[PDB]
Amino acid sequence: AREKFDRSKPHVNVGTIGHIDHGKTTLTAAICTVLAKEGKSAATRYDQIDKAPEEKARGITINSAHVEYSSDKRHYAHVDCPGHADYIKNMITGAAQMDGAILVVSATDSVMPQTREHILLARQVGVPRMVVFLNKCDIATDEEVQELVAEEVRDLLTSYGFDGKNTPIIYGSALKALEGDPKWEAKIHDLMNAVDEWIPTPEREVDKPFLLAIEDTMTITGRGTVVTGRVERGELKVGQEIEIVGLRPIRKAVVTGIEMFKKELDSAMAGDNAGVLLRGVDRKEVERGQVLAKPGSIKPHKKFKAEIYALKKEEGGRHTGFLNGYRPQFYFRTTDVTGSISLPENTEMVLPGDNTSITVELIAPIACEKGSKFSIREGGRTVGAGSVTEVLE
Amino acid sequence: TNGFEVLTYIPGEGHNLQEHSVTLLRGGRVKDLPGVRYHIVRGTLDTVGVEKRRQQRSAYGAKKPKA
Amino acid sequence: MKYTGSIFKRSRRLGFSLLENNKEFSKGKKRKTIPGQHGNRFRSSTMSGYAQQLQEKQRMQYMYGITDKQFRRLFRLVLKQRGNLAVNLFRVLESRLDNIVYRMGFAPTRRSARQLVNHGHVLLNDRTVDTPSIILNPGDKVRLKAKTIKIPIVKAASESGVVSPFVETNNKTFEGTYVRFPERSELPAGINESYVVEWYKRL
Amino acid sequence: RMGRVHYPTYRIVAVDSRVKRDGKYIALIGHLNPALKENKCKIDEAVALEWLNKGAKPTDTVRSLFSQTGLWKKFVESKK
Amino acid sequence: NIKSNEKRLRQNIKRNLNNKGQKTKLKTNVKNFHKEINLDNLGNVYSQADRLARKGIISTNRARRLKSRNVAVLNKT
RNA sequence: GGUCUUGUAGCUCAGUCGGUAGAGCAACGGUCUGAAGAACCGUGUGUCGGCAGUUCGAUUCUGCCCGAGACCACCA
RNA sequence: UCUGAGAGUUUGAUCCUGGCUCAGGAUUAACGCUGGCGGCAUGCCUAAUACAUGCAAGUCGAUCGAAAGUAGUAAUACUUUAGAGGCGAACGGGUGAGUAACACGUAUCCAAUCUACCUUAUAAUGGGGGAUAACUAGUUGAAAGACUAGCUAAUACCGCAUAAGAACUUUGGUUCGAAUCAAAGUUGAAAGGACCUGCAAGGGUUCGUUAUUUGAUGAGGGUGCGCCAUAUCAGCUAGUUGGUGGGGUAACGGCCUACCAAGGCAAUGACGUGUAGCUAUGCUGAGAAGUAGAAUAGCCACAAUGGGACUGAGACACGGCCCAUACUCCUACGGGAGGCAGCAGUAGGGAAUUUUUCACAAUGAGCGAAAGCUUGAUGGAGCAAUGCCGCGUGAACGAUGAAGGUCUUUAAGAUUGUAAAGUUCUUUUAUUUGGGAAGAAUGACUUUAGCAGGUAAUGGCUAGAGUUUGACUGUACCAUUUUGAAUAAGUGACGACUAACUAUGUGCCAGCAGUCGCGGUAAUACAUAGGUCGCAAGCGUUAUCCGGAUUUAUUGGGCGUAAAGCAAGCGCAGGCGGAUUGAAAAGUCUGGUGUUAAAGGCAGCUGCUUAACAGUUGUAUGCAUUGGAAAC
């Protein structure tokens, strides 16, 4: 019994996406640190944020950083997401299986297009009513410019269709809160209070067989492969044989342990973050991106057809047309799957801003549902996030 | 995996070997080519044998077509 | 298949006899040559001894719908005693349960008897049985399971069944018991015992 | 015992303490049918008295078995 | 590691102490008998040898062997 | 788990920094030993991975990615 | 009363000698299509490579002291024992690195040994002493740990007499170094608890507790014999073989020591390079035999590598101890911890292996006056078509032939094929409605009647009754009980060997091949389409062991020209060898006791629906062995 637990309050996933040196990791550490002083303990030090090579000497995360804690209202799980290119393959996975969108901005540097990309990320997964904090204001004094910066942030969010006026913006700084100043700890508490509202509850379903997208796998000495993902429809308890569909041929396996980031659970509600231990599986077939479910699940598909609402120029995307040889990338919240686009007849070229339902030719057979949220991306940015409407192969 | 460089013959549809790839072999001698007593197992690895071929469909490893 | 399905097909090429008269069913003049395309000239041009031994073994195999492994087991059982191989082999041949069920006139075909045995509607020693490969001896009960008497098949079988003297039963009472052992000429003499017995040097 | 799964058979022996079960045995002393209702216990009744006089440790079912066979009845008289 | 044998170790420490203390008595007594030849010292040797022979310390066969050879060498007188 | 490089004839390879399909095996018609092979003469065999932008068209400048080929998963 | 099949392959074609490949049978097998089930077995051979976590040997209050608690009104029934004492952990568990020999299997010897339990019987269980933990308090150490002073008694320890029978000397008797009754002198025993009759006393019963008496268990040495290949390994071995005095083992011994003598083995294969756990047995065959030493069992062996000893009678001890090693870790950087070849699980290797699954409910062990737990020994459930065995994917009828594929490509024709439609039919598995047996009628424990000796009981034999003892557990099996032909077949080959042929493409390309080899465009073999057959929830190819291979020839070959007579002779041992008489005892046959384990075969039964399989009964291969049988 590594950890016995039965949650008495609903589980909620919270995350953060920020550009380098905004205090994104600083705020990530500070929220849990200040909650380790009034509420339940979190044991979140600076050594439990980054572990990969070259990321400890830079202060930015390569993969998501996992913390979890209780609260008076909702049980939260904090996942830390990267913010820069050459690692977007991992920030997409980190920020695509969240249930909130926290934006970190500072009064020491003006808003840069990375904030616009953060609003873009909030736009793809469809997370309205975000919580924005003007964090890290412990730098050279500003008297009235901060209000203008806040106004610019408020009318900055309308470029993607998000409300700006009803956003609970509060002054504060997390670095001084981590330094040992209770005055800014109060500001972080106000940030938490603003977070308590406007964040959508994770999607919950109790009767679907199962579905979980792979993110990574972890090896445990004596136990085996610990899978990373999110039980987001249905449920899964110990002792149920499970099929594996997607990116690989179907494979029947047995679940042995149900982890919840080094915990032990009987049953986990849909939408929560946990882990599952597999029996006799191989990491060459169990790869980041595929699907595991219960017998009778969604059929695997290699080709299909989906509608599209391409993002406009104002909505962060590009403005130049695409030919019929178009082979962009697709993201089912987990992995970059490449695919060809075939364009409806009686039209040669379509640009972001105009849309016709396109047929996608995926590289590998990916288990996809009809209406699945899938993002079409290329060139290190997003041009749209559509939904599947028909299956041909 | 043992250190012994050996020749193999390539049955199946042409070739499915790509200049230091991974393969699995089977025994069997041939009169025509001296110095080789081995074959490749088509179907169970990067080599998969099927196109316009259904006789002797045990070697040349492939799936059964479905109506 | 375990059940060949068509029986007529095998009797075409092999000239196999299952019941009273199968070479000419009056079915529009069925050929004794091989079905398909090549029933033209390959009649007797390339015969060698091993061949006749082989289709004689095959014909012997397809009188009862018996697979090769269970016949090998039966030959092992035959070799488990002494005496003439022909008599013991034939005796263990009829002794199979479905064969007696068919020979009583309670089933017009061995396949129907085997199906009835498998489905559990046949009784031995006052207890239901479901194995169509039983070895039997004197004093073995067989009933009709009166729930299975309204069947359109068993009724006609009882009305016009085949009479066998080695096992005696009253047709209208539907209660039988194994009585004695058969005689060689009673069984179809077209089967040559030598070839089928001595092709099996396997076990 | 060396019977079969879900239908085993046990042969009884008054083996010494340190000796392993179902291994090498000092002697063969009949057997029993512990699965069906016939009480069939085929025994020799030719060396058990000698071994008991010479030293033998009875196990749990030995009491009932040799009370049924009446050997305990004659054991008290053999002691005298 | 088993929690059932450390007590045995602590026991046999004192057991070994006692065994050494009794064995050295035999050692000194046989020294005395070999130095000076008489009946009384060898009788004391025999007494101690039988006392430690009954105890599970030295095999009684060895005590018998040693007493037999001691009386054999005593037979000169 | 992200790192560097590659994708060019049927094969191996070349290689203007934005105006080059260059070499050798291979294929074709033959000379010819009786014929094969070899040689010799002929002359041709490449959207220079798969997409979107920078721009004057970018194979060759970038960006995602498809694959692959070596390296690294250190601190209980 | 057993008791065997051949075929092709060179040359123009033959008769040879002869070299190979194929038709089978088994397994610890991987690969493709596959996927129905049942019961039974099997499932690290590869890296004796390291392995997290939890279990895998624990037990006794009627052994003792004492401490925590429950509750009874403070005295105290009662639970835990945190500790000293009792046994076991030495057997069970696993794996074969090493071992070419007393390692293994037997015939056999101790005239040199051993053995607690368990059964035959005597004598005592009496009287004293001392400390001794845990505890309490204190020091030190980061923790692990070491200590420093008081505490109590223990079935722990040591004395005292107890002492016939025991251990060792003195005489009279005795067997091929042995067996006994005497007379003495030295000597050696300890422990109580519990239960009662009974004024306590006095007395019994029980668990024990000590030395002798038969016993068994297991261990240990010299044995006869048999035991892998290799003289393109010829000498080998000096505490090493012999003599003696001391020890040392339970004991004889260069086992060791001290002092003296040079031996021993080996051509009739030592020494040595290599492989390997030996055996019962798995499999090929008619057998002599070959082969693999699966698992399962008997025996030997080491616990990452070496050592070194100790408690117990027994280890050189798989989860005991002291240390050097290599590695993984803690460390406040002084010092410490560690061993999955125990079960599952993980990393690596390999094509290649079970679930971090469950219960002491059956046996076996550990304890006791017992419920009680330890029981990853075991018993099961899941996964694995790995290997067997056995049942489905329908049944009776139905056609001068339903289309459509194929072929003649005349089609006014042959096929597919009674395959289908149709009728009901019964659902083995599905489906669902009920009962849940079953190994467990074994098993303790509590009461009713006499028999062991005193009866006053406890106590040992019984008979009977009894509540209670189920993981498998809705099981296989039945209920005409719900629906339903339904919820379910491929596979290799088709020139010959070798039952199974026709068209199209392809043109020494693509390929097949176990052999003749097939392709220079009219391919019955390349690939498809149709048809066919062999087999079947298994199927063909590969990795293997034998058979056919009479191809190691004793059984059952040869040496003139096919491979083969040393160029001959003198010629030790070694194998043979004219005839008789008589004794013979090594073979040869009759005789049983010990075995030759059991299992495994061979036959007969018993049972799960028969079979698979399990059990039962006997069945034999080899040496002692005591009589005898008389030609070789």
Curated annotation (Swiss-Prot), chain A:
- Matching CDD domains, A to Z? EF_Tu, EFTU_II, EFTU_III
Q: Name one GO cellular component term.
A: cytosol
Swiss-Prot/TrEMBL keywords: Cytoplasm, Elongation factor, GTP-binding, Hydrolase, Magnesium, Metal-binding, Nucleotide-binding, Protein biosynthesis
Protein location:
Cytoplasm
Positions bound to GTP: 18-25, 80-84, 135-138
User: Where is this protein primarily located?
Assistant: cytoplasm
- Alphabetized InterPro entries for the sequence: EF-Tu_GTP-bd, EF-Tu_GTPase, EFTu-like_2, EFTU_2, G_TR_CS, P-loop_NTPase, Small_GTP-bd, T_Tr_GTP-bd_dom
* Annotated positions binding Mg(2+): 25
* EC number in record: 3.6.5.3
First and last residue of the signal peptide: none
Tell me what this protein is called: Elongation factor Tu
UniProtKB/Swiss-Prot annotation, chain B:
> What superkingdom does the record give?
Bacteria
Q: How does it assemble?
A: Part of the 30S ribosomal subunit. Contacts proteins S8 and S17. May interact with IF1 in the 30S initiation complex.
Q: What does this protein do?
A: With S4 and S5 plays an important role in translational accuracy. Interacts with and stabilizes bases of the 16S rRNA that are involved in tRNA selection in the A site and with the mRNA backbone. Located at the interface of the 30S and 50S subunits, it traverses the body of the 30S subunit contacting proteins on the other side and probably holding the rRNA structure together. The combined cluster of proteins S8, S12 and S17 appears to hold together the shoulder and platform of the 30S subunit.
Tell me its family: Belongs to the universal ribosomal protein uS12 family.
> What's this protein's name?
Small ribosomal subunit protein uS12
Name the species this protein comes from. Answer: Mycoplasma pneumoniae (strain ATCC 29342 / M129 / Subtype 1) (Mycoplasmoides pneumoniae)
Mapped onto the parent protein, the portion here is: 71 to 137 of 139
UniProtKB/Swiss-Prot annotation, chain C:
The source's superkingdom equals Bacteria
Question: What GO cellular-component annotations does this UniProt entry give?
Answer: small ribosomal subunit
**S4 RNA-binding domain boundaries:** 95-156
Transmembrane spans: none
Q: Keyword set for this entry?
A: Ribonucleoprotein, Ribosomal protein, RNA-binding, rRNA-binding
Pfam families xref list: Ribosomal_S4, S4
Gene Ontology biological-process entries: ribosomal small subunit biogenesis; translation
Mention one GO molecular function: structural constituent of ribosome
Q: Which InterPro entries match?
A: Ribosomal_uS4 (IPR022801), Ribosomal_uS4_bac-type (IPR005709), Ribosomal_uS4_CS (IPR018079), Ribosomal_uS4_N (IPR001912), S4_RNA-bd (IPR002942), S4_RNA-bd_sf (IPR036986)
Q: Which NCBIfam families match?
A: PRK05327.1, rpsD_bact
Mind telling me which HAMAP family this protein's record contains? Ribosomal_uS4_B (MF_01306_B)
**Family assignment?**
Belongs to the universal ribosomal protein uS4 family.
Q: How does it assemble?
A: Part of the 30S ribosomal subunit. Contacts protein S5. The interaction surface between S4 and S5 is involved in control of translational fidelity.
Q: What does this protein do?
A: One of the primary rRNA binding proteins, it binds directly to 16S rRNA where it nucleates assembly of the body of the 30S subunit. With S5 and S12 plays an important role in translational accuracy.
Q: Which PANTHER family match?
A: 30S 40S RIBOSOMAL PROTEIN (PTHR11831), SMALL RIBOSOMAL SUBUNIT PROTEIN US4M (PTHR11831:SF4)
Q: What is this protein called?
A: Small ribosomal subunit protein uS4
From Swiss-Prot, chain E:
Q: What is this protein called?
A: Small ribosomal subunit protein bS20
User: Which InterPro entries is this protein grouped with?
Assistant: Ribosomal_bS20 (IPR002583), Ribosomal_bS20_sf (IPR036510)
UniProt keyword terms in alphabetical order: Ribonucleoprotein, Ribosomal protein, RNA-binding, rRNA-binding
Q: What does this protein do?
A: Binds directly to 16S ribosomal RNA.
Give Gene Ontology CC terms: ribonucleoprotein complex; ribosome
The family annotation for this protein states:
Belongs to the bacterial ribosomal protein bS20 family.
Q: Does the keyword Chloroplast apply?
A: no
Task: Drop me one GO molecular function for this one.
Answer: rRNA binding
Q: Name one GO biological process term.
A: translation
